[PDB]
Amino acid sequence: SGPVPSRARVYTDVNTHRPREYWDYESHVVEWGNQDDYQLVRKLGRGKYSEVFEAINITNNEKVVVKILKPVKKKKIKREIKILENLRGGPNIITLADIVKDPVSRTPALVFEHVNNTDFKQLYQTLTDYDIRFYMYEILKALDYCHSMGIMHRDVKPHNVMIDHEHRKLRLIDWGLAEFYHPGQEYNVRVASRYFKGPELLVDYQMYDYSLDMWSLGCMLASMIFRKEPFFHGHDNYDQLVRIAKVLGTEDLYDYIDKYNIELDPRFNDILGRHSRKRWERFVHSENQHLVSPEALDFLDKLLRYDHQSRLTAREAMEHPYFYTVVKDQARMG
Numbered sequence: 001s002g003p004v005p006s007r008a009r010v011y012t013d014v015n016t017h018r019p020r021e022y023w024d025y026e027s028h029v030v031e032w033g034n035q036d037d038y039q040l041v042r043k044l045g046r047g048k049y050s051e052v053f054e055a056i057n058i059t060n061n062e063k064v065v066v067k068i069l070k071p072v073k074k075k076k077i078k079r080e081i082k083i084l085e086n087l088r089g090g091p092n093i094i095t096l097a098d099i100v101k102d103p104v105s106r107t108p109a110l111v112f113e114h115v116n117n118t119d120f121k122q123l124y125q126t127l128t129d130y131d132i133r134f135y136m137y138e139i140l141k142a143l144d145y146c147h148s149m150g151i152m153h154r155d156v157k158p159h160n161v162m163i164d165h166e167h168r169k170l171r172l173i174d175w176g177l178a179e180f181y182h183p184g185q186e187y188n189v190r191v192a193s194r195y196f197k198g199p200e201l202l203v204d205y206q207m208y209d210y211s212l213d214m215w216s217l218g219c220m221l222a223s224m225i226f227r228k229e230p231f232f233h234g235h236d237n238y239d240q241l242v243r244i245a246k247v248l249g250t251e252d253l254y255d256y257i258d259k260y261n262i263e264l265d266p267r268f269n270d271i272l273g274r275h276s277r278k279r280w281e282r283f284v285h286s287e288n289q290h291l292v293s294p295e296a297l298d299f300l301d302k303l304l305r306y307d308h309q310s311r312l313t314a315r316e317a318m319e320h321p322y323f324y325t326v327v328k329d330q331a332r333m334g
């Protein structure tokens, strides 16, 4: 008896009803810009499969960010490009401004708009209750848009949400793990940062969907309103699930496993032990209480659910009373 299959309860067939060339990124033909339009200024980061630089566009003197892709698979490069082009112009989605090659060595690089981001080590220390609601609503706009366009981000975490606080500007970045959703497809569960991985990933349930992004978003919310980053801090993947179960409780965890007929490694029942479901108020103290409200806790509680089918969609989340003051303030023209 294998696990019970699952499909997304919204936007299930968005790619099915779109032309092949929308989601078939291997057939995409890239049109290359000019590498000599950009000058690299300083290395911002490196990880993975790329190195990221602040750069200048020397045709107009604008700052941009250049990500040079190490020789990671061609297929992964075309997937990220196709997804960035598909989502371009969507709300709070980082803009891919150019794609270039070294003409001689054939090394590809993505060029993005620059975000002057307030460093997420600090920021989270002057953000008000209103600020959090505002930025959460903007993140939800981006997720509802990319989900509605048939795409899962799969790496939602504070490092991938750039915020230029003085311009109240937010961009969702690093689409290198993002994938097209197709119902019934079994996906790689090695995505997302450990601290933001959903239960589906940690119990190796491969037929997941957009709702994975909503778990990750719930983790960010908790860490922002309770001022504890990351909120669920496991020392490896097994322990990550234990940290979740110490809050959400083991009873609902086993009901989840039971519903999808999922088989856990023997050692898990050993280290998961037995834990009550805690009240969210347990994490409210003098220092974070100004960021917490009944609305906030009701919202968080509908995001952080084991069962991926029972979590709010991005759209439903934007309807939540937590955002009432944001939404009325954002209804304009100028």
Ligand SMILES: CC(=O)Nc1nnc(-c2ccc([N+](=O)[O-])cc2)s1
Binding pocket: 044, 052, 065, 067, 094, 112, 113, 114, 115, 116, 117, 162, 173, 174, 175
């Ligand atoms: C000061 C500073 O860090 N500015 C930045 N502005 N946009 C950035 C960026 C955009 C996209 C990606 N990406 O998508 O992988 C990475 C980084 S970084």
